[PDB]
Amino acid sequence: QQPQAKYRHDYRAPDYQITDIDLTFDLDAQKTVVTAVSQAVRHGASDAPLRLNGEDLKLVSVHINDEPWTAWKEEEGALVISNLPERFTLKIINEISPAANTALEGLYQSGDALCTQCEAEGFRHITYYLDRPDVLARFTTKIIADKIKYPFLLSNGNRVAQGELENGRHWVQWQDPFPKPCYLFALVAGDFDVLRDTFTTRSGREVALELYVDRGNLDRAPWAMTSLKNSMKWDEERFGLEYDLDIYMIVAVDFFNMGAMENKGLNIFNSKYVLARTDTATDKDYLDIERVIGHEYFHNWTGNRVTCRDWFQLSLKEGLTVFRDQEFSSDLGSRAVNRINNVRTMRGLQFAEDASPMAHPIRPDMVIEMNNFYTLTVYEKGAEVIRMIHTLLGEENFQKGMQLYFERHDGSAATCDDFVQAMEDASNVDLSHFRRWYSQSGTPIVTVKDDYNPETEQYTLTISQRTPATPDQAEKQPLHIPFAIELYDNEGKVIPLQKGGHPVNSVLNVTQAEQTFVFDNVYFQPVPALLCEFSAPVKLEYKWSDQQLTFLMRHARNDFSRWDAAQSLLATYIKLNVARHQQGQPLSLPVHVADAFRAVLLDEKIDPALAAEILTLPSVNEMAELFDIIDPIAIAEVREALTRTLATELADELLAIYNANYQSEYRVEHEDIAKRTLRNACLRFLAFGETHLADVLVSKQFHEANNMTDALAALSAAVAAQLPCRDALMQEYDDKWHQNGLVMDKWFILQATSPAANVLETVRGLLQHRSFTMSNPNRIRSLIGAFAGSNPAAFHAEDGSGYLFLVEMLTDLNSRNPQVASRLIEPLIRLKRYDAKRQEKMRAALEQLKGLENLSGDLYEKITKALA
Ligand SMILES: [NH3+][C@H]1CCc2cccc(-c3ccccc3)c2CC1(O)O
Ligand SMILES: [Cl-]
Ligand SMILES: [Cl-]
Ligand SMILES: [Cl-]
Ligand SMILES: [Cl-]
Ligand code: NA
Ligand code: NA
Ligand code: NA
Ligand code: NA
Ligand code: NA
Ligand code: NA
Ligand code: NA
Ligand code: NA
Ligand code: NA
Ligand SMILES: [Zn+2]
Questions:
Q1: What is the CB < 6 Å shell around ligand 1?
Q2: Which of 33, 130, 311, 607 is 20 to 30 A distant from 545 in Cα terms?
């Protein structure tokens, strides 16, 4: 009764195309009537039926060339229409109920507004259609609604007609000239404030920009508007791409399963990625709005003008658009901080997915529920694969490849292979072996051994690779790994790479299971920097000495290498101290490790942006990936103990740098953000100083803050260190902000990730909090999701209480909102990484969920893999 898996190798062109669709919506929250008039063309055999997808539709009528049709049947998920001519007009009338749509897939209610989400397969919840992304149709959309309740009626494209009717109704008709797959359809109806502006493209096209927000929120919209203009300008400058319509609409909605969605000319955003004011939004919020506005804008070419032939090609648009958003953020802001944080995500979150039961290549081969594959792998590893192409080609060749990709595939629904072929053909770089990155799951492990020969002045790297088997793939092969290096002499100067009288490129092509690279004219023993700028998404095994690593922290040319060396240095002592914790022994840390961080604090020449990240310890999820068996309690308690030890050893320096980076003016400007991130990195440690000093410092910052970045940093510190002021500050924040859900999400996260012994009792009680509701995905993610995913020490309490709590929540969400349920179940799918007693409790939890009445396909897919 659960759906069967679908396979990439079963792709077949559609038997029918639809070239044009004329939609009419007679809108109502309880009942919406949809009329869909489609112009269809048969491409397949004359006896093949038209198979339309549809979910939870009330069919009213079926006509073919205005003839009521008798040769049809409804089956599970489908309307099957037989005996059709080669070309015909299909007319479907059906009814749907937005108010009953709690899954937020299709047409649904967000507060008093009506809005849509159609990716991946939501349009079939609106009408019977060819809901597959290689069917590209020209849409015209006529929306009829009560004028008082729904004064703004929006769909893709341009307004081409409008009218008024009896009984207080009105209508607007929209025409989008670009053929599209239906996952890019959008409709919005509601009452909004509208921020209006203009962008003029470099060739002179004036684009009207319209940001729709709830009434009263115009003064929270200018940063998103500014970011949209910045995105448009950057895509012109960096990629040579201009917007292609004369109207760009963005609608902010409060109820949205995703971050945002690139519907053509009518993006729909979670309010979290639009609304910002300095008293309510942090620096991180500002830069996330920039990133997400950019991402959705960049999809206009990488996703919309060229779309996906089938959903197994998702990374064609998502890896490439993530790469574009990273490059945008990096160009405008701190490249090093962006790269560092994307590598933290890869190593600490995506690597874990790639070892888990849900492991998949960036181009999946097997899918049950496609909405389960909007993953760290498809997105973030997808972007690392694009970035490897960029590394192998260089910017100029890479842009030639982009240009050839659009020239060949503009206006079509293409494949990952098409994209690689365009890059290969434009650049003359052979990517045949490289293609295996699209087909193979799991994280490669690259092992490096080195040798310096003083007699010949040669340095030899012996490099091996392997990918462990994953649950989805028993066969693994070597990859084409771009392996960037730099060699340093004793004075920190770069040693030129050469062999036999010729320069050697610093990107080594590691293509074999084992190979040897020899460098000549190496006159002194080198300190290597390896896998520079995380040049391939791999685990590196090299036997660093502590002093090589502190040398790199002082001398490496690229800021990323200095941070990465610090990570390698910490990793050794995180592993040491988790083993000690398990034997009841306290933290042990050589003096020279603390001194390396002391030197970072006192180095006046280091970019504060970099110093702040070096002084930000790995998260508990990053730490977990260091271990064969995760002990989440040891990891959490070692992270705190490490923080305390550094706070004590560096107390004077931390306070000096905290004070030196004080800023009385607040500005959303990258140099100011960097100083603030350094100051607040110091605050985290100072919060673990002597209690009375810490309590005073933290509470003062909370009360004196003139911006939410500094207020939240102080509040977070009070929770993390369990300071005396904590309860008072948390109550003050609630009393001030309880009516603002986006702001309370920060507070729910702090509650959920608290180190307090009674955290689960508190989290359970917050299910009844005035600012919490199970009807809102953001609230769910901020309280329940943060508990299960970001507080593994409490989620994995040895009494099993965290698993039982999550089962309760998932029993609700399986029925209410399966997409949110499927995001929330992920911590349980990782059970084989834990000790036997925890595995037993997690299996029991998953078996309870497996037995639910009306188990969603979303959860079924993950439960089945986890219990295998
Ligand atoms: N096509 C959509 C699908 C929904 C989805 C799912 C998971 C993540 C994201 C997302 C990634 C980076 C920045 C902002 C959002 C998105 C947005 C999207 O545009 O990719
Ligand atoms: Cl109604
Ligand atoms: Cl809003
Ligand atoms: Cl930290
Ligand atoms: Cl316990
Ligand atoms: Na016709
Ligand atoms: Na930059
Ligand atoms: Na499905
Ligand atoms: Na579904
Ligand atoms: Na050696
Ligand atoms: Na060595
Ligand atoms: Na180079
Ligand atoms: Na090679
Ligand atoms: Na509530
Ligand atoms: Zn995207």
A1: 119, 258-262, 292, 295-296, 299, 318, 374, 379
A2: 607
